[PDB]
Design an enzyme around this catalytic site. Structure first.
Site, PDB file in Angstrom:
ATOM      1  N   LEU A 186      -7.463  34.088  12.180  1.00 44.98           N
ATOM      2  CA  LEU A 186      -8.909  33.980  12.265  1.00 44.98           C
ATOM      3  C   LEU A 186      -9.503  35.341  12.603  1.00 44.98           C
ATOM      4  O   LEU A 186      -8.855  36.197  13.213  1.00 44.98           O
ATOM      5  CB  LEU A 186      -9.357  32.942  13.295  1.00 44.98           C
ATOM      6  CG  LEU A 186      -9.352  33.256  14.786  1.00 44.98           C
ATOM      7  CD1 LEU A 186     -10.361  32.370  15.468  1.00 44.98           C
ATOM      8  CD2 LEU A 186      -8.004  32.984  15.363  1.00 44.98           C
ATOM      9  N   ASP A 187     -10.747  35.528  12.187  1.00 50.15           N
ATOM     10  CA  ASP A 187     -11.379  36.832  12.167  1.00 50.15           C
ATOM     11  C   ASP A 187     -11.763  37.261  13.576  1.00 50.15           C
ATOM     12  O   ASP A 187     -11.964  36.437  14.472  1.00 50.15           O
ATOM     13  CB  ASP A 187     -12.611  36.785  11.277  1.00 50.15           C
ATOM     14  CG  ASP A 187     -12.295  36.245   9.910  1.00 50.15           C
ATOM     15  OD1 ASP A 187     -11.142  36.406   9.462  1.00 50.15           O
ATOM     16  OD2 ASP A 187     -13.190  35.631   9.296  1.00 50.15           O
ATOM     17  N   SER A 188     -11.868  38.576  13.764  1.00 53.86           N
ATOM     18  CA  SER A 188     -12.245  39.098  15.069  1.00 53.86           C
ATOM     19  C   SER A 188     -13.701  38.796  15.385  1.00 53.86           C
ATOM     20  O   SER A 188     -14.057  38.607  16.556  1.00 53.86           O
ATOM     21  CB  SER A 188     -11.999  40.600  15.117  1.00 53.86           C
ATOM     22  OG  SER A 188     -12.922  41.266  14.280  1.00 53.86           O
ATOM     23  N   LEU A 189     -14.546  38.741  14.355  1.00 51.13           N
ATOM     24  CA  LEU A 189     -15.964  38.447  14.532  1.00 51.13           C
ATOM     25  C   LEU A 189     -16.163  37.041  15.089  1.00 51.13           C
ATOM     26  O   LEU A 189     -16.882  36.837  16.081  1.00 51.13           O
ATOM     27  CB  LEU A 189     -16.663  38.632  13.182  1.00 51.13           C
ATOM     28  CG  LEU A 189     -18.176  38.604  12.980  1.00 51.13           C
ATOM     29  CD1 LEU A 189     -18.736  37.199  12.810  1.00 51.13           C
ATOM     30  CD2 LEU A 189     -18.834  39.289  14.142  1.00 51.13           C
ATOM     31  N   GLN A 196     -13.838  35.508  16.599  1.00 52.76           N
ATOM     32  CA  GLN A 196     -13.226  35.576  17.923  1.00 52.76           C
ATOM     33  C   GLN A 196     -14.237  36.017  18.971  1.00 52.76           C
ATOM     34  O   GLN A 196     -14.172  35.582  20.125  1.00 52.76           O
ATOM     35  CB  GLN A 196     -12.010  36.501  17.867  1.00 52.76           C
ATOM     36  CG  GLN A 196     -11.186  36.659  19.136  1.00 52.76           C
ATOM     37  CD  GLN A 196     -11.648  37.817  19.988  1.00 52.76           C
ATOM     38  OE1 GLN A 196     -11.787  37.701  21.202  1.00 52.76           O
ATOM     39  NE2 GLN A 196     -11.918  38.940  19.341  1.00 52.76           N
TER      40      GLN A 196
END
Ligand SMILES: CCCCCCCCCCCCCCCCCC(=O)OC[C@H](COP(=O)([O-])OCC[N+](C)(C)C)OC(=O)CCCCCCCCCCCCCCCCC
Ligand SMILES: CCCCCCCCCCCCCCCCCC(=O)OC[C@H](COP(=O)(O)OCCN)OC(=O)CCCCCCCCCCCCCCCCC
Ligand SMILES: CCCCCCCCCCCCCCCCCC(=O)OC[C@H](COP(=O)(O)OCCN)OC(=O)CCCCCCCCCCCCCCCCC
Lengths: 64, 73, 95, 176, 119, 111, 157, 459, 171, 165, 128, 87
Positions: L41-44, L46
């Site tokens: 899953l993406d850091s954004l 996150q």
């Protein structure tokens, strides 16, 4: 008993605090009604507002 | 302390504001909100919490009969 | 980003030491510390008595002391000390 | 201006703008549902050119986005009642008495709390007994002539406690 | 109000002002209507310890109101007939002050009309 | 009359006592809010009365004693008065502050 | 007990060696070490800083000192005594500076101008004088209980 | 008062011929004995002053100052240990006997019937305090501070001698009583201008005036604690006392030449309340506060009004007590942290928990809290000066505002907000220091109950 | 007691109530409660104190004086004459201060007893107050701080000389 | 005013400590039916602002504006007081509408409480003070002034009309 | 879009919109690394003098004492009497003083002139 | 003013409010599960996770700890550091 927290739910209530709440709001409303009819009529100030002074002449030697 | 952890996926979302934003934003064409985080905020003993004149006028549901008694005096 | 394994390990030792310190801050030895309305209304009554004792005697023997705006007498009533009628209020009409 | 390095990154600055714009939107946009709508709108507006491999394009549009963020910021945002600037901000600093004290109590009071003070005595001997060898050795060897960081490695060598544990671990409970 | 906007939109003559109230002189054309009731008993009034700017007309109603309120003090809701009479009499005084105002108004309007038609 | 004077003077002097009490206690009133609550209750019940006597009669009074430095053509003493404002202001502040004592018993619980 | 040579006589010159020794003496960036210049205002060879210093330095950097925003070896800015939090919070302004001052002084001038309008244009109600009994209330003005009556009466309408 | 003078001499040699570890108790005990002994003097009755043959007299202008100095002696001495406690037996006996001889000259000065005697005992006040601050000046330019002190006090005070001999050989002897009686006006020539300028200039330097108020701060930041208190309280209020004496003569020329001194005192009083708002160096702020209070005193003395003289001596006594207290608390904090700077000593609400209460009480006495004698003084100064010029209330009220501001600022700066978590060396407050707190403030409030003692001779 | 010669008081005029109610009368109940509770033992304590000091007595007097003649019957130096003159003068000054004090106390009394009839039955006492304070303003005011006695008499000659010449030319 | 805002501050801070000392209108939204004793106290206090006709908060405020319009007044000050009474009506309605009426927003793990005799007695005591004692004080005072009592059309009703709008 | 946040003597130019930073040079990054190193070594010396358990005294800051001696007593050396120094000293020494002296001249002249006349409000002016 | 808090209770609560989120599966949710490494899953999003858990627990974790947690166990570590929950 004690009081307890709860997660993401509508909180519990005792019947006593909510019945005093309804009691006090209804007594406020009873006071504004038992004040609003019973002796006044104070927002309308107990006197008919007199007109521009009489809308009549003959006032102590007016000029003809 | 027991908490019972009222579980996930229980909410079966269906709520009015979240439903409107899901439909409008699916019409926009994204369908990716955070999602169903706030069904417990939007319904339960919630979901038509009282409107304006009921909130300002919670009193007269019992005071009118007392005023009828006062007329009876 | 992310830690290093050494930073995580350092944090783990801080977890161990912080658990031990806060568990030490827990205490209940069952001897934590150790030892090495008549009153109310007589408290009501007694300064009332002292200040009334003070308030008649010294206060009165000083002449210009506690004084008054006079009670208001009335045109149709009597006087408790002397005793007479004031000539009362005049004609009533247009009421 | 960070304990790990000097440069932040492009990605850190973008991400901090994201957190600030989203927090400002929380403050501007009450009832939470049109907020949730506009949060998806902001996440889409970052997704408009997430695809950029470029760098100068990214930082140029980041600068224009900073203009756009300061264009519509909010005066008194919903800052938390624990965050600095917020409502508490060492509200409960009424009893954050520092832990170097309690040495200077009269021995009647140290007769009042016996076992806890015996435990503090053995902690303090654990501090002094384990300061010379391992801590002074790792502060001889592991510091380079320029330390160049604001973070130390643990005592992963063989045994006992990592250095400088004392006024980091032994901080007050933040709770009277 | 209404008189105020008429005075401020009109010229300074035909709508006269307060604080310079004797403008047309007294006993102009009066057919001897002056009684000036004076039910005050002003010596007895100063004996009854009243207030400045209450030593007025209609003050004996206030005297009776203070008398009944003194005579039945824990009757918290007693004195309103004589209070209403005092209100009624000061209402009449208010009528009189309004009559004086608009009488000077019509005097000045007719006087400027008559000097315009004589000159 | 002596009653109205002594009642206003005790509605002042029944407030001085708890501060001198804790400066002369050395022991712990754990129920120190209960002590303050009952002395404010006594002050309110002795202050509801002389206002009722005041509007009952009129009867305004000034009191004045315990002077110091009557130096020049003037003087100064402790001189305070109970008139319309100075009587019908006291139970207002007393009753308000008695309820704020209750709310402060709750709000200052763990401190 | 301290070294005399770590105090601060003289201004900046000479530009190689005194700048070098002062940059090593105060521990700053070498070429960005500023004299004021030699303004003759005292001021020695002490540095100049970006003057705001306190509502910058956000408390999540987690340095040493709690409320000074200080870390025990710093230039210790010359005007810190005006800059401390609780004294002057040099926050970044939410709008501008010129916008703030112009709108505030303009609004005060607008309200005072209409106050002068209120001072010159009163309101009143269609009301004459009261009717005080004894010649517009003699004996409850200044007095003269046996000297000066001035006969002027009231007439009814 | 010779029955009060001969125990002031004979209080000395016991301190010499006492055994070790026993000088302290003897000095304190006999000092408090003489404190009550000269408290017994207070029978100034009505019309006259009270006299004793050719050497001693007492107005109300001198008796509370006298009682204040003999009250100061146990406070003076009892502050003055723990920084010279480990030093030598002979040098410590020398120090204590030096303070006692200083106070003997002070009592000679306050009961000076004549004025030549007053000048001699004035510089007798000058000389021992030099020796004390220069032997134990505690810091690095005690040299500089003692030198400024000595040359300012002489070279101001010296032509006062020639002016008083001139008055001597123009009007007979210089008793205070004959100068009350054989006075005659001295008109607006230039000789009267220079004579008034000489006498008032010497005393301007003593107060200090604002034009030479750099005298004071070095003399306080580089003095020991007993010298600090004696210097501040007794020397500055003694200068005011001497001006109050000799302003009885020279009536008409002070109408002319009193203008620039009052001007300088007012504007520099405001500039002094400005200067003690922003400095560091915790000790020196009270020194500039004392400069501002003595400028207020100076306005009060030169405006020549009975209200002014009553409020002026009230401000003298109240500021002596408050300044000596606040110097003692500064000494306590420097005993703690060994710093004298301000931004290091921070927090201290939990730590030393009841020391804060005495800090607060001192800052409220310096506030002009209203039942305090400080506000009685400042208030009657404001009343007299508003009768004097009717627009000067601007600087009085602005002085009041900034004075309350810096006093409360020094309160909540040092001792409010956060411990700096590196100290490790504050100790819970000693019983000696709190004993000195109760030595300061209980007689202040008991003076506040019945202040009909301390007002001036124009009572 | 006191001296009603120096401290005059108006005649008491107390009205009487009239209910015309059936409450019945709470405040009379409470004032009889106050009298029968507090007023008995406090009067008894007064009685006890009166007797126990009525065993033996002390006496204090008023200090009265002679009259030393004058200041203008003393010459230019006369320290043994001017001293008597000044002390007699300064004691006259102090007792005149208390004169003005007593008249101000009477004025406070007149403001308090009248209530809101300010402009009636206080013309007498405020008028004599203005008279004595006009005298005090003329005689003891414009002399400053270091009064001895001679400044007062120089003021005296200055005032009567100036008013003599003014009424001389305006006669 | 004293009874009024003593009651209001005590109610408000009771709510603030009831929700974890957070005090902000943002994330506070729906507290109605979460026990309505304190919320009812808030709305009785807020309706006692503007002087709903006619309560203890009615008397003074409305006699003030009536005496002000029946005076030799400013032609700016009466207009300003009229507009600011409208504005205190609208922020009263905003504090109600953001205090109770909206859909509820708060962090989870709620601990909302009134199980205390002290709090209920204090709030009870002051609402009893604000329903009766205002009238009791306002009624039996001797008029040291002369009330107007004779007002034109929309010169007695008008502030109430402006609060309604 | 916006007036671009004008600078002032109060305006904290924030760390986001400079805009003069965002072509960061390599050597400026080297300077930031130097600054990080300097604060790193200073905090290391701080912790070494700090975490000694038997050290009973204070941390003994040289920087603060350096600043205090810089501020208090090391002003008069060095000093030269310059033109700007003399101008600002005259404007803060003599201006306000001579101004309030003028207004006290005027007040005393009007007051003694008017009480020389006698049309003054001193009907009773007792507490002089 | 002091609710009962355990590590197990707070761990289950964090895992709960993770599992309510949309684009992660309820299937592969682990207490030891790297958000960056092995979930993809993406850091954004996150940081959306960071935002919502900040909003639940009522305190901002800083930006400098908005970088380097990436797993629920260190999240429980940092929340136990801010809240001081051990016994
Ligand atoms: C400063 C020194 C002041 C010395 C004392 C005052 C004095 O005598 O001044 C006048 C003296 C000299 O004046 P003088 O004392 O000769 O004045 C006497 C004047 N006749 C002779 C007319 C009576 O001047 C100075 O001291 C200058 C300084
Ligand atoms: C007339 C002469 C007045 C002289 C005033 C001198 C004040 C010196 C002390 C200043 C001070 O203490 O500053 C600290 C304080 C900071 O307040 P602030 O910036 O609001 O910080 C909280 C965040 N909002 O700031 C203040 O307290 C500011 C000072 C108060 C306002 C001063 C002006 C009042 C009169 C205005 C005109 C009428
Ligand atoms: C109006 C009132 C005026 C009152 C003036 C009183 C005197 C003024 C102050 C005199 C002392 C000044 C002083 O302290 O100067 C410091 C200086 C010594 O300091 P420094 O040079 O650092 O030391 C070297 C030794 N190692 O010391 C010196 O340089 C001293 C120089 C001699 C000063 C003599 C005193 C003045 C006499 C004037 C006669 C003309």
């Amino acid at each position: 008993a004690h009081i307890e927290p709860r997660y993401r739910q509508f909180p519990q209530l005792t019947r006593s605090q909510v019945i005093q709440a309804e009691f006090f709001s209804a007594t406020m409303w009873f006071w504004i009604l038992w004040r609003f009819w019973h002796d006044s009529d104070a927002v309308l100030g107990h006197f008919p507002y007199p007109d521009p002074s009489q809308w009549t002449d003959e006032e102590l030697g007016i000029p003809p | 302390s027991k908490m019972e952890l009222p579980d996930y996926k229980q909410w079966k979302i269906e709520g009015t504001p979240l439903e409107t934003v899901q439909e409008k934003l699916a019409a926009r064409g994204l369908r990716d909100p955070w999602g169903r985080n706030e069904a417990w905020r939007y319904m339960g003993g919630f979901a038509n919490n009282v409107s304006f004149v009921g909130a300002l006028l919670k009193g007269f549901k019992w005071g009118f009969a007392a005023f009828v008694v006062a007329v009876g005096a | 980003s992310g830690y290093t394994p050494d930073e995580k390990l350092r944090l783990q030792q801080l977890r161990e030491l912080r658990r031990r310190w806060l568990k030490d801050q827990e205490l209940s030895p069952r001897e934590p510390v150790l030892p090495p309305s008549i009153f109310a209304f007589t408290h009501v009554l007694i300064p009332v008595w002292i200040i009334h004792y003070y308030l008649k005697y010294h206060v009165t023997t000083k002449p210009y002391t506690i004084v008054e705006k006079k009670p208001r007498i009335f045109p149709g009533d009597t006087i408790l000390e002397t005793g007479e009628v004031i000539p009362p209020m005049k004609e009533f009409p247009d009421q | 201006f960070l304990p790990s390095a000097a440069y932040l990154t492009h990605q850190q600055k973008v991400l901090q703008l994201y957190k600030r714009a989203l927090r400002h939107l929380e403050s501007r946009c009450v009832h939470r549902d049109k907020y949730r709508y506009f949060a998806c709108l902001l996440r889409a507006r970052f997704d408009e050119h997430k695809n950029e491999k470029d760098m100068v394009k990214a930082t140029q549009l980041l600068r224009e986005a900073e203009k756009e963020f300061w264009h519509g910021q909010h005066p008194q945002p919903y800052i938390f009642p624990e965050s600095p600037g917020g409502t508490s901000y060492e509200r409960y600093e009424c009893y954050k008495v520092p832990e170097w004290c309690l040495d200077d109590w009269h021995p009647s009071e140290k007769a009042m709390y016996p076992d806890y003070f015996a435990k503090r005595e053995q902690w303090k001997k654990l501090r002094r007994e384990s300061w010379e060898r391992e801590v002074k050795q790792l502060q001889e060897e592991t510091p380079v002539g320029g330390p160049r960081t604001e973070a130390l490695p643990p005592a992963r060598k063989q045994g006992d406690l990592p250095p400088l544990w004392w006024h980091i671990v032994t901080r007050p409970r933040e709770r009277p | 109000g209404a008189h105020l906007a008429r005075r401020y939109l009109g010229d300074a003559s035909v709508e006269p002002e307060p604080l310079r109230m004797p403008t047309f002189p007294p006993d102009y054309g009066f057919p001897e209507r002056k009684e000036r009731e004076m039910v005050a008993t002003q010596q007895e009034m100063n004996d009854a310890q009243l207030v400045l700017q209450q030593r007025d007309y209609c003050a004996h109603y206030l005297i009776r109101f203070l008398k009944c309120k003194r005579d039945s003090f824990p009757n918290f809701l007693a004195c309103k007939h004589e209070q209403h009479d005092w209100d009624y009499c000061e209402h009449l005084d208010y009528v009189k002050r309004m009559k004086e105002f608009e009488r000077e108004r019509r005097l000045l309007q007719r006087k400027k009309r008559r000097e315009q038609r004589e000159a | 009359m002596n009653l109205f004077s002594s009642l206003t003077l005790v509605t002042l002097i029944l407030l001085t006592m708890p501060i001198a009490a804790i400066n002369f206690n050395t022991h712990k009133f754990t129920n120190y809010p209960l002590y303050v609550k009952t002395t404010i209750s006594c002050a309110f019940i002795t202050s509801m009365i002389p206002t009722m006597m005041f509007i009952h009669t009129g009867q305004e009074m000034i009191i004045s004693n315990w002077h110091w430095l009557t130096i020049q053509t003037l003087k100064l003493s402790l001189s305070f008065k109970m008139d319309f404002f100075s009587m019908m202001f006291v139970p207002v502040a007393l009753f308000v502050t008695w309820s704020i004592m209750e709310f402060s018993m709750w709000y200052m619980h763990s401190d | 007990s301290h070294i005399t040579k770590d105090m601060l006589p003289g201004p900046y010159p000479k530009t190689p060696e005194e700048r070098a020794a002062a940059a090593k003496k105060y521990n700053m960036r070498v070429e960005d070490y500023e004299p004021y210049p030699d303004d003759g205002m005292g001021y020695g060879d002490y540095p100049k800083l970006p003057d705001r210093s306190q509502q910058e330095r956000d408390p999540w950097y987690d340095w040493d000192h709690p409320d000074l925003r200080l870390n025990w070896g710093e230039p210790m800015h010359w005007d810190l005594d005006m800059y401390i939090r609780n004294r002057v919070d040099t926050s970044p302004t939410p709008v501008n500076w010129n916008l703030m001052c112009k709108h505030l002084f303009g609004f005060v001038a607008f309200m005072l101008f209409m106050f002068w309008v209120g001072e010159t244009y009163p309101t009143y109600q269609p009301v004459g004088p009261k009717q005080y009994p004894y010649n517009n209330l003699y004996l409850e003005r200044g007095g003269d209980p046996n000297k000066e009556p001035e006969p002027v009466v009231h007439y009814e309408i | 008062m010779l029955k009060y003078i001969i125990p002031t001499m004979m209080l000395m040699p016991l301190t010499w011929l006492s055994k070790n570890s026993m000088i302290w108790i003897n000095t304190t005990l006999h000092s408090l004995l003489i404190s009550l002994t000269s408290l017994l003097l207070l029978n100034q009755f009505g019309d006259n002053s009270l006299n004793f043959s050719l050497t001693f007299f007492s107005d109300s202008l001198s008796t509370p100052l006298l009682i204040l100095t003999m009250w100061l002696l146990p406070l003076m001495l009892m502050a003055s240990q723990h920084h010279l406690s480990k030093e030598n037996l002979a040098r410590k006996k020398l120090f204590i006997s030096m303070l006692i001889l200083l106070q003997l000259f002070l009592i000679m000065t306050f009961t000076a019937t004549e004025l030549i005697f007053f000048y001699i005992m004035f510089e007798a006040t000058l000389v021992p305090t030099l020796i004390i601050i220069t032997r134990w000046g505690n810091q690095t330019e005690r040299l500089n501070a003692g030198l400024y002190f000595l040359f300012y006090t002489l070279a101001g005070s010296l032509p006062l001698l020639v002016a008083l001999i001139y008055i001597q050989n123009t009007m007979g002897s210089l008793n205070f009583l004959i100068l009350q009686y054989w006075v005659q006006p001295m008109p607006n020539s230039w000789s009267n201008t220079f004579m008034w300028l000489a006498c008032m200039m010497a005393f301007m330097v003593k107060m200090p005036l604002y034009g030479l108020h750099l005298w004071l701060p070095k003399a306080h930041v580089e003095a020991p604690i007993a010298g600090s208190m004696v210097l501040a309280a007794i020397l500055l209020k003694l200068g005011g006392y001497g001006m109050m004496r000799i302003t009885l003569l020279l009536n008409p020329i002070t109408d002319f030449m009193a203008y620039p001194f009052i001007m300088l005192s007012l504007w520099g009083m405001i500039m002094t309340s400005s200067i003690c708002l922003r400095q560091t160096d915790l000790k020196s702020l009270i020194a500039y506060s004392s400069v501002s209070h003595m400028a207020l005193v100076i306005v009060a003395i030169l405006i020549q009004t009975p209200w002014s003289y009553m409020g002026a001596t009230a401000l003298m006594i109240a500021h002596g007590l408050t300044s000596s207290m606040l110097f003692c608390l500064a000494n306590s904090n420097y005993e703690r942290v060994h710093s004298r700077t301000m931004i290091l000593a921070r927090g201290l609400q939990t730590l030393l928990p009841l020391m804060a209460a005495w800090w607060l009480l001192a800052s409220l006495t310096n506030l002009a809290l209203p039942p305090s004698i400080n506000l009685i003084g400042e208030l009657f100064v404001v009343m007299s000066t508003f009768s004097w010029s009717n627009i000067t209330i601007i600087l009085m009220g602005l002085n009041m505002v900034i004075t309350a501001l810096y006093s409360l600022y020094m309160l909540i700066t040092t001792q409010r907000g956060k411990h700096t978590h590196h100290i490790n060396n504050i100790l819970p407050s000693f019983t000696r220091e709190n004993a000195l707190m109760s030595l300061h403030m209980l007689p202040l409030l008991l003076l506040s109950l019945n202040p009909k003692i301390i007002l001036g001779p124009l009572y | 007691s006191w001296d009603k010669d120096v401290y005059p008081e108006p005649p008491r005029r107390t009205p009487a109530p009239s209910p015309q109610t059936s409450l019945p009368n709470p405040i009379t109940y409470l004032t009889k409660a106050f009298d029968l509770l507090v007023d008995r033992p406090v009067t008894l304590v007064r009685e006890f104190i009166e007797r126990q000091h009525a065993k033996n007595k002390y006496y204090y007097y008023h200090r009265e004086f002679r009259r030393v003649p004058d200041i203008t019957e003393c010459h230019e130096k006369d320290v043994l004459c001017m001293f008597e003159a000044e002390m007699q003068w300064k004691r006259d000054y102090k007792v005149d201060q208390e004169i003005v004090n007593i008249i101000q106390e009477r004025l406070k009394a007149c403001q308090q007893r009248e209530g809101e009839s300010h402009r009636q039955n206080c013309a007498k006492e405020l008028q004599q107050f203005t008279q004595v304070v006009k005298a005090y303003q003329d005689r003891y005011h414009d002399l400053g701080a270091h009064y001895s006695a001679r400044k007062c008499l120089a003021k005296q000659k200055q005032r009567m000389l100036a008013e003599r010449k003014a009424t001389k030319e305006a006669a | 005013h004293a009874f009024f805002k003593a009651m209001l501050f005590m109610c408000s801070g009771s709510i603030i400590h009831s929700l974890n000392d957070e005090q902000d209108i943002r994330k506070m939204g729906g507290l109605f039916k979460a026990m309505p004793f304190t919320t009812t106290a808030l709305i009785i206090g807020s309706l006692a602002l503007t002087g709903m006709p006619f309560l203890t908060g009615f008397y003074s405020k409305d006699l003030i504006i009536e005496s002000a319009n029946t005076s030799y007044t400013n032609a700016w000050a009466l207009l300003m007081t009229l507009v600011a009474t409208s504005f205190t009506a609208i922020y009263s309605t905003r504090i109600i509408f953001f205090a109770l009426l909206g859909q509820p927003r708060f962090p989870t793990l709620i601990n909302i409480n009134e199980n205390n005799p002290f709090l209920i007695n204090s709030i009870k005591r002051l609402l009893i003070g604000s329903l009766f004692a205002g009238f009791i004080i306002s009624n039996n005072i001797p008029p040291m002034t002369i009330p107007q009592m004779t007002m034109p059309h929309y010169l007695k009703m008008t502030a109430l009309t402006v609060t309604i709008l | 879009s916006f007036p671009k946040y004008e600078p002032s003597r109060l305006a904290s130019l924030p760390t986001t919109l400079d805009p003069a930073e965002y072509d960061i040079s390599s050597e400026t990054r080297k300077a930031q690394a130097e600054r990080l190193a300097i604060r790193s070594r200073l905090k290391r010396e701080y912790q070494l003098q700090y975490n000694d358990p038997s050290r009973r005294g204070v941390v003994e800051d040289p920087a603060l004492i350096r600043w205090t001696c810089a501020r208090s007593a090391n002003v008069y050396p060095n000093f030269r009497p310059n033109t700007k120094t003399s101008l600002l000293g005259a404007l803060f020494g003599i201006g306000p003083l001579i101004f309030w002296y003028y207004v006290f001249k005027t007040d005393r002249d009007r007051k003694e002139k008017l009480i020389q006349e006698g049309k003054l409000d001193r009907t009773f002016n007792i507490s002089y | 003013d002091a609710p009962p808090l355990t590590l197990e209770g707070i761990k289950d609560r964090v895992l709960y409010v993770l599992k309510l989120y949309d684009k992660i599966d309820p299937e592969k949710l682990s207490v030891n599960s790297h958000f960056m490494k092995d979930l993809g899953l993406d850091s954004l999003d996150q940081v959306e996770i960071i935002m919502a858990m900040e909003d639940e627990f009522g305190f901002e974790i800083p930006d400098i700890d908005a970088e380097k947690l990436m797993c629920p166990q260190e999240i429980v570590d940092y929340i136990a550091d801010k809240k001081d929950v051990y016994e």
